[PDB]
């Protein structure tokens, strides 16, 4: 019985990267050719394991993490990367054993005048550890002066909205991302 990936892949709504979605699935089969040839994928890399032996593998559960980021932020979804996404939103460990799938979804996730739904984290005191999630909304203090919840100079709201206009360059257009973690 192959795994039920359409529930996370074909889901009509995706989550922001800062409140990224985690779905576990148990006791099933993951074939590489069966899902590579599933659709139009702009990013499909597998670390740790080998794609060809994906269904020669045994594991307890599979966590299918999923979120929406923008095109030139997909390269951050990798081990040992850095930047706003991989430091404040979704860190992958250095020993990651699994896969990263991405694809363009301007047509789904962009609205004329903007799709102000998908958010991302812009600041944080410290670097997320692998698979840590944070949806706190505290005023990020950037200087010595305390913020006190009141926004202003060196006192920023930690979250911003993507533009996600269908007019933007593919560079800064919505991308659907699913991360398959095997443990």
């Amino acid at each position, epitope marked *: 019985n192959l795994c039920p990936f359409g529930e996370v892949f074909n889901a009509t709504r995706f989550a922001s990267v800062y409140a990224w979605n985690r779905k576990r699935i148990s006791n099933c089969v993951a074939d590489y050719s069966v899902l590579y040839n599933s659709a139009s994928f702009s990013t499909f890399k597998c670390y740790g394991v080998s794609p060809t032996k994906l269904n020669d593998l045994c594991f307890t559960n599979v966590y299918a993490d999923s979120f929406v980021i923008r095109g030139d932020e997909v390269r951050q979804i990798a081990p040992g990367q850095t930047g706003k996404i991989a430091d404040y939103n979704y860190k992958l460990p250095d020993d990651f054993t699994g896969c990263v799938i991405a694809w363009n979804s301007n047509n789904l996730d962009s609205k004329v005048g903007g799709n102000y739904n998908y958010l991302y984290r812009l600041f944080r005191k410290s670097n997320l550890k692998p698979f840590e999630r944070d949806i706190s909304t505290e005023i990020y*203090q*950037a*200087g*010595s*002066t*305390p913020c006190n919840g009141v926004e202003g*100079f*060196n006192c920023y709201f930690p979250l911003q909205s993507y533009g996600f206009q269908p007019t933007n360059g593919v560079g800064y257009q919505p991308y659907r991302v699913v991360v398959l973690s095997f443990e």
Partner: single-chain antibody, 227 residues
Framework: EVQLQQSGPELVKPGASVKISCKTS????????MYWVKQSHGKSLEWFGG????????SYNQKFKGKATLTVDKSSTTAYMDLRSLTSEDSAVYYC?????????????WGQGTSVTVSDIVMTQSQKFMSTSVGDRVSVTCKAS??????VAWYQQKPGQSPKGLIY???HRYSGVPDRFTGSGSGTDFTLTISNVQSEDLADYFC?????????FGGGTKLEIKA
């Protein structure tokens, strides 16, 4: 190897304008907020305003509202100030200074200064002059108008020289500051004790609050030595 290098002295005739610069190096430019501090008649320190190099965010002290514009150039890791319809007031010494957060609070690195010629909280420093001898203990007071709980710093101005941070966060010593400088205070009244006064401690000592903007200074306390 932190270095804040400002532009040279500017002599400009009244009503004109001039753009001084602060070329930084030795650290990652975009990671630390930058401030400008004005030192003029009365020989006292006036916070001028800040700029965040990462987003170009600004905050202006409203005394000088419209007197200057703060910009940065990430291409050359440089902070600029652009002055505006100068009077005789504007003749002063302007320092650029780096916010230390999160490692050291307040202004942990200053520049050499540029001599240009042509509900606020009030830090009050009782004595404008003290005299001890070497090896004596001396203390210096500041009274803040409001509550500023431990968000106070102490600076050292040796003659002809930029201020150097001594105490930050009311009681913590900056990197390289001798043990005979201890800070004490909380809430509104703060003291700076120099315990074993050395020859080289002759200087002006300024307090500063950084609880809210604008940042504000005491008037200073000349400290003079004899032996």
């Amino acid at each position: 190897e932190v270095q804040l290098q400002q532009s040279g002295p500017e002599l400009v005739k009244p009503g004109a304008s001039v753009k001084i610069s602060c070329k930084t190096s030795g650290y990652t430019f975009t990671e630390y907020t930058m401030y400008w501090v004005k030192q003029s008649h009365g020989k006292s320190l006036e916070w001028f305003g800040g700029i965040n190099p990462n987003n170009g965010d600004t905050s202006y002290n409203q005394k000088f509202k419209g007197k200057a514009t703060l910009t940065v150039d990430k291409s050359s890791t440089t902070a600029y100030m652009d002055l505006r319809s100068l009077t005789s007031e504007d003749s002063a010494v302007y320092y650029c200074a780096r916010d230390g957060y999160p490692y050291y609070f307040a202004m942990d690195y200053w520049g050499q200064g540029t001599s240009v010629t042509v509900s606020d909280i009030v830090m009050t420093q009782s004595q404008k002059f003290m005299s001890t001898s070497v090896g004596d203990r001396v203390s210096v007071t500041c009274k803040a108008s409001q509550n500023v709980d431990t968000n106070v710093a102490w600076y050292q101005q040796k003659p002809g020289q930029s201020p150097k941070g001594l105490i930050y966060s009311a009681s913590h010593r900056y990197s390289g500051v001798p043990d005979r400088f201890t800070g004490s205070g909380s809430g509104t009244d703060f003291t700076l004790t120099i315990s074993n006064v050395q020859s080289e401690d002759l200087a002006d000592y300024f307090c500063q609050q950084y609880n809210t903007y604008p940042w504000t200074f005491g008037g200073g306390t000349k400290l003079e030595i004899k032996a």
